[PDB]
Design a protein around this motif. Structure first.
Motif, PDB file in Angstrom:
ATOM      1  N   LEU A   8       0.748  -1.259   0.000  1.00 52.84           N
ATOM      2  CA  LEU A   8       0.000   0.000   0.000  1.00 52.84           C
ATOM      3  C   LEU A   8       0.787   1.325   0.000  1.00 52.84           C
ATOM      4  N   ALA A   9       0.037   2.413   0.207  1.00 54.39           N
ATOM      5  CA  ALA A   9       0.549   3.786   0.217  1.00 54.39           C
ATOM      6  C   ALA A   9       0.344   4.498   1.545  1.00 54.39           C
ATOM      7  CB  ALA A   9      -0.116   4.586  -0.887  1.00 54.39           C
ATOM      8  N   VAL A  10       1.341   4.363   2.409  1.00 53.04           N
ATOM      9  CA  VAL A  10       1.319   4.938   3.743  1.00 53.04           C
ATOM     10  C   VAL A  10       1.693   6.408   3.857  1.00 53.04           C
ATOM     11  N   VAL A  35       2.016  -5.160   3.186  1.00 49.97           N
ATOM     12  CA  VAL A  35       1.363  -5.410   4.464  1.00 49.97           C
ATOM     13  C   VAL A  35       0.265  -6.454   4.426  1.00 49.97           C
ATOM     14  N   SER A  36       0.188  -7.231   5.499  1.00 53.86           N
ATOM     15  CA  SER A  36      -0.810  -8.279   5.624  1.00 53.86           C
ATOM     16  C   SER A  36      -1.706  -7.965   6.810  1.00 53.86           C
ATOM     17  CB  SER A  36      -0.127  -9.626   5.822  1.00 53.86           C
ATOM     18  N   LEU A  37      -2.992  -8.293   6.702  1.00 53.39           N
ATOM     19  CA  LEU A  37      -3.937  -8.015   7.783  1.00 53.39           C
ATOM     20  C   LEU A  37      -4.163  -9.196   8.704  1.00 53.39           C
ATOM     21  N   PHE A  44       3.439  -3.792   8.639  1.00 52.49           N
ATOM     22  CA  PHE A  44       3.999  -3.198   7.418  1.00 52.49           C
ATOM     23  C   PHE A  44       5.476  -3.603   7.239  1.00 52.49           C
ATOM     24  N   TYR A  45       5.772  -4.341   6.163  1.00 51.39           N
ATOM     25  CA  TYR A  45       7.124  -4.842   5.852  1.00 51.39           C
ATOM     26  C   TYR A  45       7.672  -4.204   4.548  1.00 51.39           C
ATOM     27  N   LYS A  52       8.606  -2.924   9.633  1.00 49.46           N
ATOM     28  CA  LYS A  52       9.331  -1.748  10.125  1.00 49.46           C
ATOM     29  C   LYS A  52       8.381  -0.624  10.558  1.00 49.46           C
ATOM     30  N   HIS A  53       7.268  -1.016  11.171  1.00 45.76           N
ATOM     31  CA  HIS A  53       6.249  -0.096  11.659  1.00 45.76           C
ATOM     32  C   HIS A  53       4.939  -0.877  11.795  1.00 45.76           C
TER      33      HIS A  53
END
Length: 230
Positions: A8-10, A35-37, A44-45, A52-53
């Motif tokens: 995604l776009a964080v 990212v996986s839910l 977030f990888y 890393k967050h």
């Protein structure tokens, strides 16, 4: 397990500073990640083996954001924290998923926190009673506008304006609480989220003024400052 996942776009959009206070994060241009839910956790990888967050998406609320500037396809979560965040996807399709999804895992843990079995059974159980809170307080405060007006004794006006700026902020909480359990028992059901107009509608003026401090009285907006209180 993973409810879904990908990349995604964080870009942070507002956070709960200490002392109940909502503010727009530092102008960070849209960043990248995958990212996986996992249940309530939204890990977030990085590019191309440990995230890393993090983001504990609890009770939170995601609203569409097709409104945003250029980059089309856009989402928006309001974190139980009082945090704002905004992810940008591939297509309105992927826009479905993560949304109808996340919204799931969140309302999910809810089913659990309340040690109940049937999803819709908890929701409906919350949906109903919620309004009951409404009409009782949605009136309790009304009744005051009906007395404080005809009253003039200054000591009983400052105790009125009390249980009012009080019953107003208990009113607020309540509904923004419904749009949750509903836009949740709605994903879980398959029909579009409710009307983002109705949401704002019942939103406090003084509370709206602040939604003016920051930016666009956004569904997320009044779902944001909404918790910084909680």
């Amino acid at each position: 397990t993973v409810r879904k996942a990908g990349a995604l776009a964080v870009k942070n959009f507002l956070v709960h500073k200490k002392n109940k206070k909502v503010e727009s994060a530092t102008r960070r241009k849209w960043k990248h990640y995958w990212v996986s839910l996992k249940g309530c956790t939204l890990f977030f990888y990085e590019t191309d083996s440990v995230p890393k967050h993090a983001v504990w998406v609890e009770n939170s609320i995601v609203q569409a954001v097709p409104e945003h500037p250029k980059k089309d396809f856009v989402f928006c979560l309001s974190n139980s924290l009082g945090d704002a965040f905004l992810f940008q996807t591939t297509s309105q399709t992927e826009l479905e998923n993560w949304i109808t999804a996340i919204h799931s895992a969140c309302a999910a843990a809810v089913a659990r926190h309340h040690h109940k079995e049937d999803t819709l059974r908890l929701l409906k159980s919350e949906i109903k009673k919620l309004e009951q809170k409404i009409d009782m307080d949605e009136k309790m405060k009304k009744m005051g506008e009906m007395q404080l007006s005809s009253v003039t004794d200054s000591k009983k006006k400052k105790t009125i304006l009390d249980q009012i700026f009080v019953w107003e902020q208990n009113l607020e909480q309540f509904q923004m609480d419904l749009f949750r359990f509903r836009c949740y028992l709605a994903s879980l059901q398959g029909g579009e989220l409710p009307n983002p107009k109705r949401l704002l509608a019942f939103a406090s003026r003084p509370t709206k003024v602040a939604m003016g401090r920051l930016g666009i009285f956004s569904v997320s907006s009044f779902h944001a400052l909404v918790a910084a209180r909680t």
